[PDB]
């Protein structure tokens, strides 16, 4: 997709698995809209990452991509990617 949902990390997270990424307070993540379409959460639940569970996206702040817990982040809006 040409669109991304944006999140900001509210807490630090140390990666627990190879596919995970580290989060640091204030990091900004972009989840491709296609990812949430695929999971069935694109009909509004993008704004409730704590209800989705694990997310996969790009940490714009660190340049790393991978899985991170949705309860650790806040939805901040969407952008073109």
């Amino acid at each position: 997709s040409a669109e991304g949902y944006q999140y900001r990390a509210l807490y630090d997270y140390k990666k627990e698995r190879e596919e995970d990424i580290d989060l640091h307070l204030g990091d900004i993540l972009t989840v491709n809209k296609g990812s949430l379409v695929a999971l069935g959460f694109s009909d509004g639940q993008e704004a409730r990452p704590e209800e989705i569970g694990w997310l996969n996206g790009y940490n714009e702040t660190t340049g790393e991509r991978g899985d991170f817990p949705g309860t650790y982040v806040e939805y901040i809006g969407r952008k073109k990617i």
Partner: peptide, 9 residues
């Protein structure tokens, strides 16, 4: 689903 970790603190 993979379990979520609790929030830190």
């Amino acid at each position: 689903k993979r379990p979520l970790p609790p929030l830190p603190s």
